[PDB]
A paper describes a structure:
Aiming to validate the TIII models predicted by AlphaFold-Multimer using experimental approaches, we purified the X. laevis TIII tetramer after recombinant expression (HAUS1-EGFP-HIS8, 2xFLAG-HAUS3, HAUS4 and HAUS5) in insect cells. We next subjected the purified augmin TIII tetramer to cryo-EM single particle analysis, obtaining a cryo-EM reconstruction at 7.7 Å global resolution (and Methods section). Strikingly, the predicted TIII models provided an almost ideal fit into the cryo-EM reconstruction, explaining all resolved density segments on secondary structure level. We next optimised the fit of the highest-scoring model into the cryo-EM density by molecular dynamics flexible fitting (MDFF), which resulted in only minor adjustments. The overall elongated structure of the augmin TIII tetramer is characterised almost entirely by extensive coiled-coil segments that are predominantly formed in a pair-wise manner between HAUS3 – HAUS5 and HAUS1 – HAUS4, respectively. The TIII structure is characterised by a central ‘bulge’ region, composed of all four HAUS proteins, separating the TIII tetramer into two segments. While one of the two segments is assembled exclusively from the HAUS3 and HAUS5 subunits (H3/H5-arm), the other segment is formed by all four HAUS proteins (4H-arm). The N-terminal segments of all HAUS proteins are located in the bulge region, while their C-terminal segments form the 4H-arm. The very C-termini of HAUS1 and 4 are located at the tip of the 4H-arm and are predicted to form a flexible kinked coiled-coil. Cumulatively, integrating structural data from cryo-EM, crosslinking mass spectrometry and neural network-based structure prediction, we could in detail elucidate the structure and conformational plasticity of the augmin TIII tetramer, the functional module for γ-TuRC binding. These data indicate that the core segments of TIII form an overall rigid structural scaffold likely serving for specific binding and positioning of the γ-TuRC relative to the pre-existing microtubule.
Numbering used by the authors:
A (entry chain E): 82 to 288, 405 to 666
B (entry chain C): 97 to 245, 351 to 597
C (entry chain D): 1 to 309
D (entry chain B): 1 to 230
Amino acid sequence: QQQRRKQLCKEILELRAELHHLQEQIQTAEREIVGQDLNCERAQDLCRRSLLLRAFNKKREEECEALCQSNKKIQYRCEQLQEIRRASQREVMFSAVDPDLSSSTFLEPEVLRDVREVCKLRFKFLRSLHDDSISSSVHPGKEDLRSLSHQQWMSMAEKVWNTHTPNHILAALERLTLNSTQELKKLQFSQAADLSKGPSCQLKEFSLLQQQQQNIQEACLLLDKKQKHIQILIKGNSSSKSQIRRSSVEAQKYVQDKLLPWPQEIIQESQRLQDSIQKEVKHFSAICLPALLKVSTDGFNLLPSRELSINRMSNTHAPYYGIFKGIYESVRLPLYKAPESVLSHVADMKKQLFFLRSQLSSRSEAISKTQRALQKNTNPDTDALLKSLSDHYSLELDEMVPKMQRLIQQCEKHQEYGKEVQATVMDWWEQPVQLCLPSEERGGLTLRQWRERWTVAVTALQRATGSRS
Amino acid sequence: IEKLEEEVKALQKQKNLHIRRRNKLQMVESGNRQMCLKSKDKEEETGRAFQEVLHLLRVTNKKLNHELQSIVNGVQTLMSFFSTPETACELSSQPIFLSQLLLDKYLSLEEQSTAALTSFTKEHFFEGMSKFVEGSDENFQLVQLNVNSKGDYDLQMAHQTSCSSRQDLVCDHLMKQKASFELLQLGYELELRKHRDVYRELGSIVQELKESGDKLEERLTMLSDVNLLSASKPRSNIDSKDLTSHRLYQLLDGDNTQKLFRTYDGLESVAQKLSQDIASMRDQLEVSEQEHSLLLSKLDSHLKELRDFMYPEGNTLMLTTPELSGEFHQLGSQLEKLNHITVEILGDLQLKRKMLESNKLQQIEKQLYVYFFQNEEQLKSIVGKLEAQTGGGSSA
Amino acid sequence: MAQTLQYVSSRLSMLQIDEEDLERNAQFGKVLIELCPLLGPNGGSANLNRELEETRRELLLQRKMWMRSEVIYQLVQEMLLDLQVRKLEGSLTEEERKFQDGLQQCMLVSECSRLLTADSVPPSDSTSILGLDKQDLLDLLPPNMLVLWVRDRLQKQLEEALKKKCFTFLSFHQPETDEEGDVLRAAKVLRLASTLEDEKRRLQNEQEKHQEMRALLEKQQEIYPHVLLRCLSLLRQAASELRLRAQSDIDRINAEYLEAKSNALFLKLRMEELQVLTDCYTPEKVLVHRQIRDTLEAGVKKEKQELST
Amino acid sequence: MDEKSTKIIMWLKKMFGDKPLPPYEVNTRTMEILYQLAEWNEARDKDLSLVTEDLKLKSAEVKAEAKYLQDLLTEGLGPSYTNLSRMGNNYLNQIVDSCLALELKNSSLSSYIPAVNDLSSELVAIELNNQEMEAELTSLRKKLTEALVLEKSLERDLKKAEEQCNFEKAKVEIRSQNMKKLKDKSEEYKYKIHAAKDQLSSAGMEEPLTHRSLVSLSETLTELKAQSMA
């Protein structure tokens, strides 16, 4: 399959690069997406400020409305008072008395008439008490009718004080005193004249002996009872007049002591609530809305939500954003991984190191052991040993082999030489030189003839015995 | 191949997944880019809305300031009605209130009216009443008559009757004066009551602002709370509040000491250092594998060289050269041939020496030409001699 | 001993140890085998590992509760954003504007309500922020009948948003589901959680397997140089003791022996040769030979003169 | 040896409680190994303690936050978010379940999309690295087996070689002895070769006085005679 296999391995390497190229394109888009996150938290804070401030505004408007109402109440007192003051400043012409004329009119004002009526009703009530005092006793039963005239008196009285200004009333009363006094002055003048004379010129103006005498005694008694009534009435007015003077000083002290310190205190309190909206709104525009958002992690303790360690990376606008992004790259953790994995990951990092450390220690030992064993196991060095093998090899071809071929050759020559030596034995035994004589005779016999004689001679010797060799 | 074919299939399905996720990813990217733009527009829109509510609040502040001022103005205007004179710049004005007015004048008039009644009671009634009937502070007070002071009797009665009428007149006059006082004294009481109401009113109004102020001061401190306010810069010091940064720093540096030298900058530094440490340890193990790879490549190179040198093609551990081993067997064989040749020669040689020892006639045979060349007589003798021992030929 | 080594090396990766260590301290190996169950494969002690696994499950549990509310919360944020963008393009129905207005206002109103509502119990004696309360905020929320209409509507919008959010999830993990029938897609959503869990667990197992194979490769690498050194040691023994010492001596003695043997046999032959010449060629015979030789030479001379002439 | 020894006895006491220690043999090596083990174990015991206490805090912050989104929702949405159909709930649980598995720091798509991408990319990378690492293991397994096959092949071949060398040496002892003798035999022969030569040359020994030359002289004499006549 080798060629198809090579083609497929190429296709895999080619595919792996392409997956990588796609993966790099995905990574680049992911990085832009992480950077492109929703925080609309800035905008939402601003929406929150608008709503908080709308609600705030309504609450302050409610406060304003309370103050408007307070201002109206003070404005009503001030209006009543400005009109009473204005009315008091006028001239009041009263009904004339010269007692010289009774053909004189000025009209009586209402203040005068209304004051004449309430004083007249009370005069009548005082007169019923008086009339009783001469007929000596308060009888029962007129006491209830009396309460009721007192209530009417109060009512005409409450009306006189509210409708008319105090200076006008006072003045009407002043005049009332004068008129009543004038009635006194007419009685004074007519009667004064008589006093240089006789007291019997007083019988011009309002005008058995034992029986007359009694009538004079009873008449003295009558004068005593009227004199006494005058004494209680004079002493009663003297207390009343005094009591008016005390009531004025007491009232004046109260006006001075009680009402006058108030404005400074109102000025103090008023300055404080001047610009409340502006002090508050100024601090609020500086404020941070998630810091106002409180969470309790004990059931008790409110801590600002932003100050939790879990929220630092959710928020891009947090100041710890930079610190905790940096913690993520340093501990080598993805841009989406839960905050809780940083600490477990650091323990894993410490573990990971101890693992690399041990493999390095183990490997260094494996390398060292092999190097010490290579040195012990070499006597001499492998490079020396390889040269020595090669020297010994080159030497067998050069010395040992050629010497052998020389010796093989030498044995073949000796072997051949041995055959020649047999030829030498054969000539020695047979001696063929004997046949080399052509016809040479000595003693007129050839060597052949001598030999034949010899052979024949040995054979005759052998024959005669019955031997042979 | 089956495994490669599945891998090509697998990588291809992955390829197909990444094309599809990527196209969606282009969609999501463009879309988030659109959101990023919209959110910047939302912060601007929201800033505008906010500025309007603050404008509404600028009017409300002005209004409030105005009402506060009215209250100051209102109270300022109110107190002037409660003035006794120290003008004479104005003699146009008079006070309202009865107690604020000069009662000296009315009281003096009442004091003259009493004086007019006193002068009257004194002048027409008997001399004898001089004891005190004169008056003045407020004019004051009548003591009783001597009354006693046929024709004589009738006269006495006439005088008495004149005193009876004159006393009735005094009595009505005092009673009119009493009514006048009674109105007036009640007039101070109705006024005090109005005065009391002002006192009460100002206290309620003042109390409302006082409470409002207290609530205000609580608020003014509260919003100015620095922890509630927007943040400072990052620190360079590990914040005390955060227990997490301290555990993390501890875990990494191997602190369990209380330092004071817990810095963010330090924290990051030791974290990066550890990551660096892991990369170094990995790099060193890689260097150690390469050293190990050199050591093995050397032993293997050694091993092929040594095996190839001892072995002739890979067959067997041969020592000897084939050529030399073959020669040694071949030479030995030549030597064994060579012994035989030797043995042959000596065997023939031995036999022939044994013959010359056994027959003398045969030694002599081989000697005949020696005798031929040297002594013809000796040849004749010896040959003659063998014939002589055992008869020869003759012819005659 | 091989078992103990594998058991300790697989469970605790932080020890370089070999079999020789165990051999020399027979009892120590028993000690090592016992310490592994009291540790774990993590290096942490057994108690600590149990506690860690117990806190993780409990944390995951609370984390699931936060996450159910969190999905819903996020779906609303996404919804309000969606409808608001659509409001700006002028591509929003009137009903959606009402839905949007009611729903936005409700979230701002709850968000500002949550700022006030204190996990403590304020005193009377404390101001809340800006002097307000929840009721001041509900006053600015639109009339209850619109609120009720949005809420009735929200369950259906929420279900569409969930369906969509789950489909999206499905679309990225498994792009294959977008080309499926409606029945098949309903099945595939049901498998979405399980399938992603299987891929993660597989990645973790794949990591465990890498570490296991990493140990094996390193252990095989320990034995392998040691075998290469023995094979060399044997070759070195062959080379040294046999080829260079013994064989050179062997080769020397054989070559010399074979020469000595050849020369000796030759000389022996030569002596027996000389014995033969002495017996054949005595001075007497030689004198006689000289005479025969002269007789043939003299004859040869007579014929030569006659041939020449 | 004594500071290390104390830490190790205590650490070991830490492991077994108030129980006996298992006997072992004392030497340097065993302590050094025990010391690395004790070190790993202590470092991790600290680490796991620190991690557990954070996880307890995180659960409480998360719970606190959970209560906060739940409250936010009750107030904002009313009760209607809790009403869903069965299929609504299933879709929800899956969303939540995908989020818990990929350990997202919220439910946003911006986080979710990188998580799927990273999980797939890593899973394929670890798997491919694991395949390549199996093939290499297997290759190294053949190399080790092959190497071992050579060691035994070498034992056998060395052993046959040793037998050959032992045979050759034994023969070399006989040959070495036979050679010394052969040199001696040669020296003896040589003196006898000169003594004989001296008589033989003095005896007038020469080549034309031999049988072979003399027969050669005789055949030439007959042949020459024929020419001479012709």
